[PDB]
Design a protein around this ligand. Structure first.
Ligand SMILES: O=c1cc(CP(=O)(O)O)c2c(F)cc(F)cc2o1
Ligand SMILES: [Zn+2]
Ligand SMILES: [Zn+2]
Ligand SMILES: [Zn+2]
Length: 230
């Protein structure tokens, strides 16, 4: 019942209710003749919504906003990008044009600027050191340390026991690392262990791409990263 690539054309977005007041958004993007799905998160905050990550591009992100307005009907007042790559910040300009306040760590903002990517407007404080956590509306933001990228953040929704790992956490069906050009392979398993230590009660774990599961997605990602290292 989780949407797959065969069921979403590039340009369209699906929403999937994970728990009360928590959704993932699913879009697709083409790259080198392959089509990949990509996840982000939506968290209700009273009568408004917190968005986690763009839908990987301007067109997808415009469709994401339209699908949120149609299905949920609450305003997206803030958005957090969890690292500087295009599947997390691609579409920030669309969000900003729609009146969404876009946020990222100062680390992410700097890496986005170096990359020539779109740059979230606001800077998130309190996330500079591995193990740092801050409350942000209905979620906790956690910097586990370098993994998929040096700046990657994860997001926890305490009310729903939902852990969003972003691209630092792989789905079970992904058995090879793939693209790790900006990764810290040496630190990635240590950063995953910080996530496991901080969120042992998580019931749902959402990877950056593909199917949700439980906490065994953390050990899975460590296994894949260590195999790639060797
Ligand atoms: O599932 C993915 C998703 C992405 C984006 P990211 O690496 O930031 O998650 C991706 C990519 F951009 C290039 C590639 F060659 C493979 C990829 O595989
Ligand atoms: Zn990335
Ligand atoms: Zn990704
Ligand atoms: Zn595995």
């Amino acid at each position: 019942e989780y949407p797959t690539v065969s069921e979403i054309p590039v340009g369209e977005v699906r929403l999937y209710q994970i728990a009360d007041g928590v959704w993932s958004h699913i879009a697709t993007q083409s790259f080198d003749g392959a089509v990949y799905p990509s996840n982000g998160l939506i968290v209700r905050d009273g009568d408004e919504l917190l968005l986690i990550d763009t839908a990987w591009g301007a067109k997808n992100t415009a469709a994401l906003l339209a699908e949120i307005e149609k299905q949920i009907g609450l305003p997206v007042t803030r958005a957090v990008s969890t690292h500087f790559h295009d599947d997390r910040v691609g579409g920030v300009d669309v969000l900003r044009a729609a009146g969404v306040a876009t946020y990222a760590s100062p680390s992410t903002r700097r890496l986005a600027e170096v990359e020539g990517n779109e740059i979230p407007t606001h800077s998130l404080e309190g996330l500079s050191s591995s193990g740092d956590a801050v409350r942000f509306g209905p979620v906790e933001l956690f910097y586990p340390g370098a993994a998929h990228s040096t700046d990657n953040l994860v997001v926890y929704v305490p009310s729903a026991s939902v852990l969003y790992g972003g691209c630092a956490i792989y789905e079970l069906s992904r058995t090879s690392a793939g693209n790790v050009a900006d990764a810290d392979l040496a630190e990635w398993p240590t950063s995953i262990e910080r996530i496991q230590q901080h969120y042992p009660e998580a019931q749902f774990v959402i990877p950056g791409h593909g199917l949700p599961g439980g906490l065994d997605l953390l050990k899975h990602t460590t296994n894949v990263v260590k195999a790639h290292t060797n």
